[PDB]
Amino acid sequence: QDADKLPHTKVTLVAPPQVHPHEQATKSGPKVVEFTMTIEEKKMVIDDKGTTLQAMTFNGSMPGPTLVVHEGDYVQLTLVNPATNAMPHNVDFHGATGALGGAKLTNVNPGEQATLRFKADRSGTFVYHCAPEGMVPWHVVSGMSGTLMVLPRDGLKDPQGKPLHYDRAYTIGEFDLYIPKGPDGKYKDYATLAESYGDTVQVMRTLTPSHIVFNGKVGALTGANALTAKVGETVLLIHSQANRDTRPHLIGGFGDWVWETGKFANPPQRDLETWFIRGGSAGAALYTFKQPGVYAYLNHNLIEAFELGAAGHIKVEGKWNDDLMKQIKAPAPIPR
Amino acid sequence: QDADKLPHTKVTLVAPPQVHPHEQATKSGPKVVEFTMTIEEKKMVIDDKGTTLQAMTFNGSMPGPTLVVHEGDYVQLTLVNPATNAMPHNVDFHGATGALGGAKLTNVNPGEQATLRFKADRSGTFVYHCAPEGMVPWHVVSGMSGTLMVLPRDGLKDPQGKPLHYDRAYTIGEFDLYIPKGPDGKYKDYATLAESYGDTVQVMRTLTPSHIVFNGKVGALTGANALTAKVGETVLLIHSQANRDTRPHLIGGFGDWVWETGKFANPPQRDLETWFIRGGSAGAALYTFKQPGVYAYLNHNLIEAFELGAAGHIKVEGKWNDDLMKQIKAPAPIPR
Amino acid sequence: QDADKLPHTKVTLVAPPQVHPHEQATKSGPKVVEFTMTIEEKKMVIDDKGTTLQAMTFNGSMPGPTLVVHEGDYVQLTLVNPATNAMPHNVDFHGATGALGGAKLTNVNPGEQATLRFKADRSGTFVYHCAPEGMVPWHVVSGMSGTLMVLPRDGLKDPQGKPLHYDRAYTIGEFDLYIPKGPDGKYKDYATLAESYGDTVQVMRTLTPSHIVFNGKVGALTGANALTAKVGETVLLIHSQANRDTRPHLIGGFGDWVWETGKFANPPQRDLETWFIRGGSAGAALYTFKQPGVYAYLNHNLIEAFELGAAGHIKVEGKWNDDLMKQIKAPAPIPR
Ligand SMILES: [Cu+2]
Ligand SMILES: [Cu+2]
Ligand SMILES: [Cu+2]
Ligand SMILES: [Zn+2]
Ligand SMILES: [Zn+2]
Ligand SMILES: [Zn+2]
Ligand SMILES: [Zn+2]
Ligand SMILES: [Zn+2]
Ligand SMILES: [Zn+2]
DSSP states (O other), rough: OOOOGGEEEEEEOOOOOOOOOOOOOOOOOOEEEEEEEEEEEEEOOOSOOOOEEEEEEEESSSOOOOOEEEETTTEEEEEEOTTTTOBBBEEEEEESSSSSGGGGGGBBBBTTTEEEEEOOSSOEEEEEEEETTOHHHHHOOOOOEEEEEEETTTBOOOOOOOOOOOOOEOOOOOOOOEOOHHHHHHHOOOSSSSGGGHHHHHHHHHTTEEEEEESSSSSTTTTOOOOOOOOEEEEEEEEEEEEEOOOOEEETTEEEOOOOOOTSOOOEEEEEEEEEEEEEEEEEEEEESSEEEEEEEEEEESSIIIIIIOOOEEESOOOOOTTTTEEEEEEEEEEO | OOOOGGGGEEOOOOTTOOOOOOOOOOOOOOEEEEEEEEEEEEEEEOOOTTEEEEEEEEEEEOOOOOEEETTOOOEEEEEETTTOOOOOOOETTTSSOGGGGGGGGGOOTEEEEEEEEEEOOOOOOEEEEETTTOOOOHHTTOOEEEEEEEEEOOOOOOOOOOOOOOOOEEEEEEEEEOOOOOSSSBOOOOOTTGGGGHHHHHHHHTTEEEEEEESSSSTTGGGGOOOEEEETTTEEEEEEEEESOOOOOTTTTEEEEETTTTTTSSSOEEEEEEEEEEEEEEEEEEEEEOOOOOEEEESSHHIIIIOOOOOOEEEEESOOOTTTTEEEEEEEEOOO | OOOOGGGGEEOOOTTTTTTOOOOOSOOOOOOEEEEEEEEEEEEEEEEETTTTEEEEOOOOOOOSSOEEEETTTTEEEEEEETOOOOOOOOOOOOOOOOOOGGGGGOOOTEEEEEEEEEEEEOOEEEEEEOOOOOOOHHHHTTTEEEEEEEEEEEEEEEEEEEEEOOEEEEEEEEEEOOOOOTTTSSSSSOOTTTHHHHHHHHHHHHTOOOOOEEETTTTTGGGGOOOOETTTTTEEEEEEEEESSEEEEEEEOEEEETTOOTTTOEEEOOEEBBBBOTTTTEEEHHHHHHHSSEEEEEEEEEEEIIIIEEEEEEESSOOTTTTTTTEEEEEEEEEO
């Protein structure tokens, strides 16, 4: 059970909100699963008013890509920090044991890379995030976090041990953003990442985000970019929040089976209307669509969702079921 | 199991904090349970300093009345929006499947009504709330939410399946209010509901409520309006919070059995000191009183409870039990 | 099962973060366990910038000491309020039944003491806190809270009933502080406790702490005062938050078994990355160290931890395990 001698497999990561191809239940034995991520600092437009964020990302996206392995596997990540970045970075896996989650072994300055291996000995969805000494919160709130999903080798199970399956998985990273405003009441636009620092820490200390977004920007998961599913399909919704609590809800849907603390050896709860993702964690919910149409998937602090940005859509195809819901009488004049 | 052919029964709703008469375990088979609610926009005094809220309610109260059905029943609601209101409304049931919880099928302008039917296929306490396109949070924080309680046909059960009963049920809706202040530091008083809109959204975006109240106003559940019980009686406390998290606590009491996520097919937790209601959900706790006196039932963010309003009282009659608690020595001079 | 006739034992309390010596599983039958606490109002330096807090404490510390008993025992506390204090105090045990948790029977003015006895009939970690009529939140946020740990007579158990043991226990009280600032942007320093009142309530109503600290001050559990353990040792981390939610996380570690709502008759959850302590409660986590080094134990709202103070360290001795984590390649130039 010595990793140096086990089979190694390289996985190509995909951008959120998709999740790379993977097995749920597997007959494979433990492997060393190798991944690579390249840090990209970049200015991003995060709303439809032209507001920018001096952002920091793993692999160019918020959140970074989800890495999927099985319980008993070893994660082996090569973390690259190009010379075109200005700051030092690292990675802290909440699914790993020791050395500040791997942060102490992955400190990389612009122009450097490092490779970390850790045993993924516990099943569940876990946050990973950057955590450079002296500026931990700034790197995390600027976009550096994603999820490691460690599946049970047997796939997911209900409280009685019955198999649970998903047909499609989506990953939603929710980001509380702290964009500074100048004395004119407009959001500041910085020329460099380092310029935004001091102002940003002052907004952070208020504990009041200027924006709260799914996947890098207001409305990121809407329009052409809406999530999709079909009636009859079971979706796994992974939701990570590395800094602040959130409370996911599917409008017109449910959390059929939910691991809100995100740890698959614990029995899931069923029939949830709204679940809770503790800041610093990732959780997962399964839902099997039974009705077609456009659903909203959102943080059910409704101010945070509708005013600040924490809401996406899921467009679902299929047949309407009047036994589950029916309009008996459409809107019409009150009988007088 | 076609609702069109099932027996229909009409239920008369009662104002919070009571809950309409209903059975727990029932021998009845599935029914279509019909309810009616009329929306009332009205200015309300919400504190004892004369502060007003341009409020929006279902049936004239905050929260709206609790509707009680059994798992497998169909809820059939007629939603009326009189011409004396100024805004359009709808209803989103978190206990319903599809069409944005029914909101898409219940859009009613002043002078209109509509009737929605949905299968209540999951047990638990669920929030219902208004959700008109473009102004979802304003309608919810202005007072439009209540609970749908779907009881298991067999009544409530503990983790081992033993029957649990309540003698009386109370419904507590907790509302985070965002009342604007003018430049003189006083809460603004508006002539119309529409006048309060813009100022209200600015306060909402700060995420800091001006007041947090149970059942429409500071001290609503105190004095003549305190909840009541007797030693030996088991109470079911339903607590809904449609927009913001809260953490209920009974001072001098416990959550004997609690479903904090509010979904009765999951095993309850026992002996809770304080439980947690996620914004966008309703939860339920059972407690059997063992001591008489005046208890406080509150949000245990104590600033939110004592400074902002989120606290009520329960006056309990009966005999004091010195085996559970006794004053050994009353306050007296320190022995010198 | 009449307490007046049972054996009485006096326990000497110890300062946080230690916990007085006690048994886990015990063959003892029910006892009356007697404790004494003396209230101390005192000005404390709470950060490294010279900021002071007009603090209020049980036994001179924040949090007050943890009291440990077994399920079925009676807690008998003598609460002393010296004449050198300026305010009246009391104590509300969340582990007690009736009389506002004992607050109604322990109102003591400066120069008085009182003795309360209550049956500790439920297992779990429970908050105790001061709660004087009319100024409940001020006394709690100024430092008056600690934990009562009621262990099952059989010791802690996992979800299947297997015994769980800890080798060492630590108690962490997390305090959201509301220090006023004057017009010059500097934290105010008061000559007396009563002087700080009005300004403090205004900061409290904003719901934004100026500081959030573990055990009375930024960095209290760091340096010479860091918690300690060894590889192979199982630690019990008790975390109390009497006013505000928090989300504990061990960097590079886990919550192997966690009772986040803190009530030991409920099955714990395993493998948690981050858990949640509801304001007004205490929870407990067990972790068996598997790697040596310096860990951080923190509130995983990272702004609250790193900017506001809610973070401590645990220094762990022992052997590094390259099978759990290994640096495959140290930071070095990117291959060109
Ligand atoms: Cu970074
Ligand atoms: Cu409305
Ligand atoms: Cu006090
Ligand atoms: Zn399927
Ligand atoms: Zn972390
Ligand atoms: Zn009864
Ligand atoms: Zn909703
Ligand atoms: Zn041990
Ligand atoms: Zn309390």
